[PDB]
Amino acid sequence: TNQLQYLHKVVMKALWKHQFAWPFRQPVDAVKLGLPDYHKIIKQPMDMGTIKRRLENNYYWAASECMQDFNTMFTNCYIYNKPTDDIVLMAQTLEKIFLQKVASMPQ
């Protein structure tokens, strides 16, 4: 769809290259990051590499479905991490760009 193309080539491209994006480009590796409780707390992991791959393999039936994946990724971050962790500020910065770009998506 026009909307899924926009999420791929306008929204995702802006977020992917952002200087705060690196923690979010691939799944949380709880073993390599040493977080034995991550998957006990976060039951729907999500990340931009997964969303990007889904955008390219025609996984999504509708724009809102892809937007929900973006939301899950950010929400996971807020739920798991402490309020003072830098990664929370990074998610918020990226999430605001997401919402800005989504506001200009074809209707």
Residues annotated in a binding site for a protein: 37, 80-82, 85-86
Instruction: Supply the minimum distance, in Å, between the C-beta of residue 62 and a second copy.
Output: 8
CB within 8 A of 103, min separation 6: which ones? none
Between CA 94 and CA 107 the distance in angstroms is: 22
Angle at 66 between CA 40 and CA 81, to 5 degrees: 30
Instruction: Pick one of ligand 7UH, a second copy, none as the site partner of residue 22 (Cβ within 5 to 8 A by kind).
Output: ligand 7UH
Near a second copy by CB under 8 A: residue from 50, 71, 87, 93 = 71
Name residues contacting ligand 7UH, limited to 50-79 (CB under 6 A). 77
Query: By C-beta, is 3 or 76 nearer to ligand 7UH?
Result: 76
Between CA 105 and CA 89 the distance in angstroms is: 25
